[PDB]
């Protein structure tokens, strides 16, 4: 409560980056705190309670990312010989975690952009913060293609992708939300950002995903998804009722069925819809 | 695989070749002469008979990092056909061809030959306007292989990324 | 001479359908500015009203006109005077209008015993034909809650909810993109067609193809309703085949033709491959 105002300052002081990374930046900058002078209660229970307080938003990525950097501090914040440099001075490992998953956007931009086939148009979903940089690195390497955006309509959000893209002279056309079945034959392959990736291999994202995937299966066309290291989770859906209700909110975010996707990208690298499981089990030993 | 399977057991193999230029006839004669009772098939009447076939086994040339496979010509069509009858299709490729390429990352892993392979030059003035073309390979999506046959044993069709993480140096995908 | 007569019937009376309004328009417009011949009158003025009526973006209109011209073609006799070619033989058109007004009553009579209790229903945008069959189903003392979608070229689905809560059933609207979120909840997806074509294709508003692809995704039976009018005579294959003037940001799309499961009309119940069997029975 007393530092969720700084999370508000981090969400609306630099609105370029993601929400979860603003939460991680918020709390790790708070680790110059009023000195609790302990390892157990401070780290475990206090950052647990801070995950409970900052999870009051309708996000799914933020709480999972908080648990994730709790696991990325559970590595070797050791019992090293004195309470002077356990973590409250030897703090730079979470700093290098922050730096690595800051440059993770750049390494996804370096990897994925050399896959887009020139000539076949690619309809994209609403504004993510990794589709923009992969298209930036693609058009930076002198391609030719077309791109459409659906609105993803609880609110108009496709034109926000238009005001994102059109600033750098790339052709685009916004298309109706329920009418992606008409445009599905026109496109040949379909990329979509993530609010988070599930252990079964499906994605969770704002609502307009699963109908894109099932029209992709009907047109037998490759469905492509993109995510970063922040957006892993431990949830398990079978049919849609079992995403958690605080992670549901007429859904404001939504799951798509796990393996009628065709290929998936992450910061660990480009991988396969069963490799998702073992490569997240690699995290949190 | 076939001739050692025939060394004790009985079956009846039916074989369509791959022919932009043929080489399935070479295997057809090569196991005509160890007592197998093959039929060599034209490369189009598979769908007439694959309803009656019950198993199907192909051997590729190189398999890649999607868990996928670029094979000889005519493999994608027979593979989708075998999916239509839902009969299992078995890749007999070893642990030796596993390659960190991904299909449309690169530049046209299907690449091409002189089409005198696929055209007799003796037809007349026909060939000037037309730009004929044919590849050496196909592409089969990785959802479609039933089961590998590696050296160590049968493995999952998507058992592939851990194979690359601890059977290679996956940082050295610079190549 | 009849264009605002037709538009009076069109948008000063939103009760009837557009096709039945068009066919009532020209059937009462047999009292024509007298050219008084069989062929020339017919050809030029009926084809001319089918052209000049093309300010609307509908597809049922021209089809209903051609269905009427194939109606009028059959029993047109020859008996030596130009009085009872059709200028006296007009009561055939009167019985045609009343039988293909009674068509909506008879599809209600056919399909009232067809939705089972307990089965919730997800439905696309509005018709003048889904409500009569669902209220002839409620009026058989049944019970079923309903879902409906947004259908956005507009705020549409609120009109369907306001109509159907007045018709006394529990209604809940949903966003358009939330179809596969709630498709699995449904037991039954019924669709009022815009126009039915000879391969089981249903050209309709922007989300019926969504309903079909999610219906094969769930293997849940997908039922479409049509009257005797709107059998349009195009033939579609894919997503550019229907004419561009029917479209205009699209506004109409085309579902796949071979995955719907049961339809029904004035002539009874039809498996959606018998649509060609009855369309050859139409146009003579």
Curated annotation (Swiss-Prot), chain B:
Compartments where located: Cytoplasm, Cytosol
Organism superkingdom: Eukaryota
Clinical condition linked: Leukoencephalopathy with vanishing white matter 2: An autosomal recessive brain disease characterized by neurological features including progressive cerebellar ataxia, spasticity, and cognitive deficits. Brain imaging shows abnormal white matter that vanishes over time and is replaced by cerebrospinal fluid. Disease severity ranges from fatal infantile forms to adult forms without neurological deterioration. The disease is progressive with, in most individuals, additional episodes of rapid deterioration following febrile infections or minor head trauma.
Complex formation: Component of the translation initiation factor 2B (eIF2B) complex which is a heterodecamer of two sets of five different subunits: alpha, beta, gamma, delta and epsilon. Subunits alpha, beta and delta comprise a regulatory subcomplex and subunits epsilon and gamma comprise a catalytic subcomplex. Within the complex, the hexameric regulatory complex resides at the center, with the two heterodimeric catalytic subcomplexes bound on opposite sides.
Protein role: Acts as a component of the translation initiation factor 2B (eIF2B) complex, which catalyzes the exchange of GDP for GTP on eukaryotic initiation factor 2 (eIF2) gamma subunit. Its guanine nucleotide exchange factor activity is repressed when bound to eIF2 complex phosphorylated on the alpha subunit, thereby limiting the amount of methionyl-initiator methionine tRNA available to the ribosome and consequently global translation is repressed.
Family: Belongs to the eIF-2B alpha/beta/delta subunits family.
Name of the featured protein: Translation initiation factor eIF2B subunit beta
Originating organism: Homo sapiens (Human)
Gene designation per UniProt: EIF2B2
Positions spanned in the full protein: 177 to 351 of 351
UniProtKB/Swiss-Prot annotation, chain C:
Alphabetized Pfam families for the sequence: IF-2B (PF01008)
Gene3D superfamilies, sorted: Translation initiation factor eif-2b, domain 2, Translation initiation factor eIF-2B, N-terminal domain
UniProt subcellular location: Cytoplasm, Cytosol
Molecular function terms from GO: guanyl-nucleotide exchange factor activity; identical protein binding; translation initiation factor activity
Residue numbers of N6-acetyllysine PTMs: 31
Main localisation: cytoplasm
Top-level division of the source organism's lineage: Eukaryota
Regulation: Activated by the chemical integrated stress response (ISR) inhibitor ISRIB which stimulates guanine nucleotide exchange factor activity for both phosphorylated and unphosphorylated eIF2.
Keywords associated with the record: Acetylation, Cytoplasm, Disease variant, Initiation factor, Leukodystrophy, Protein biosynthesis
SUPFAM superfamilies recorded: NagB/RpiA/CoA transferase-like
GO cellular component: cytoplasm; cytosol; eukaryotic translation initiation factor 2B complex; membrane; plasma membrane
Any one biological process term the GO annotation gives: translational initiation
Disease: Leukoencephalopathy with vanishing white matter 1: An autosomal recessive brain disease characterized by neurological features including progressive cerebellar ataxia, spasticity, and cognitive deficits. Brain imaging shows abnormal white matter that vanishes over time and is replaced by cerebrospinal fluid. Disease severity ranges from fatal infantile forms to adult forms without neurological deterioration. The disease is progressive with, in most individuals, additional episodes of rapid deterioration following febrile infections or minor head trauma.
Function: Acts as a component of the translation initiation factor 2B (eIF2B) complex, which catalyzes the exchange of GDP for GTP on eukaryotic initiation factor 2 (eIF2) gamma subunit. Its guanine nucleotide exchange factor activity is repressed when bound to eIF2 complex phosphorylated on the alpha subunit, thereby limiting the amount of methionyl-initiator methionine tRNA available to the ribosome and consequently global translation is repressed.
Subunit-level organization: Component of the translation initiation factor 2B (eIF2B) complex which is a heterodecamer of two sets of five different subunits: alpha, beta, gamma, delta and epsilon. Subunits alpha, beta and delta comprise a regulatory subcomplex and subunits epsilon and gamma comprise a catalytic subcomplex. Within the complex, the hexameric regulatory complex resides at the center, with the two heterodimeric catalytic subcomplexes bound on opposite sides.
Family (UniProt): Belongs to the eIF-2B alpha/beta/delta subunits family.
Name listed for the protein in its UniProt record: Translation initiation factor eIF2B subunit alpha
């Amino acid at each position: 409560k007393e530092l969720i105002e700084y999370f508000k300052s981090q969400m609306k002081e630099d609105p370029d980056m993601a929400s979860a990374v603003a939460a991680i930046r918020t709390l790790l900058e708070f680790l110059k705190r009023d000195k609790g002078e302990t390892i157990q209660g401070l780290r475990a229970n206090l950052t647990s309670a801070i995950e409970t307080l900052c999870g009051v938003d309708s996000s799914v990525a933020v709480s999972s990312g908080g648990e994730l950097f709790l696991r990325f501090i559970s590595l070797a914040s050791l019992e090293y010989s004195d309470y002077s440099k356990c973590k409250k001075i030897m703090i730079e490992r979470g700093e290098l975690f922050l730096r690595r998953i800051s440059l993770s956007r750049n390494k996804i931009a370096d990897l994925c952009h050399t896959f887009i086939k020139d000539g076949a148009t690619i309809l994209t979903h609403a504004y993510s913060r990794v589709v923009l940089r992969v298209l930036e690195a693609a058009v930076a390497a002198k391609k030719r293609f077309s791109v459409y955006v659906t609105e993803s309509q609880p609110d108009l959000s496709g034109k926000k992708m238009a005001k994102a893209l059109c600033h750098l002279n790339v052709p685009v056309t916004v298309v109706l939300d329920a009418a992606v079945g008409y445009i599905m034959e026109k496109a040949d392959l379909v990329i979509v950002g993530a609010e988070g990736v599930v252990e079964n291999g499906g994605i969770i994202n704002k609502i307009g995903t699963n109908q894109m995937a099932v029209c992709a299966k009907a047109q037998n066309k490759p469905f492509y998804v993109v995510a970063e290291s922040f957006k892993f989770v431990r949830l398990f859906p079978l049919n849609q009722q079992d995403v958690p209700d605080k992670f549901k909110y007429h859904p404001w975010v939504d799951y798509t069925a796990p393996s009628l996707i065709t290929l998936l990208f992450t910061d660990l690298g480009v991988l396969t819809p069963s490799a998702v499981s073992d490569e997240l089990i690699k995290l949190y030993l | 695989f076939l001739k050692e399977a025939a060394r004790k057991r009985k079956f009846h193999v039916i074989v369509a070749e791959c022919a932009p230029f043929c080489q399935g006839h070479e295997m057809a004669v090569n196991l005509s002469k160890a007592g197998i009772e093959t039929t060599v098939m034209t490369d189009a009447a598979i769908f007439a008979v694959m309803s009656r076939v019950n198993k199907v086994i192909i051997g590729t040339k190189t398999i890649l990092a999607n868990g996928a496979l670029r094979a000889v010509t005519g493999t994608h069509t027979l593979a989708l056909a075998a999916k239509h009858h839902s009969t299992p299709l078995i890749v007999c490729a070893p642990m030796f061809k596993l390659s960190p390429q991904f299909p449309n990352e690169e530049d046209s892993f299907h690449k091409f030959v002189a089409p005198e392979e696929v055209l007799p030059f003796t037809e007349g003035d026909i060939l000037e306007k037309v730009s004929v073309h044919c590849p050496v390979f196909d592409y089969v999506p990785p959802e479609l292989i039933t089961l590998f046959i590696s050296n160590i044993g049968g493995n999952a069709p998507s058992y592939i990324y851990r194979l690359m993480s601890e059977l290679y140096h996956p940082d050295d995908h610079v190549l």
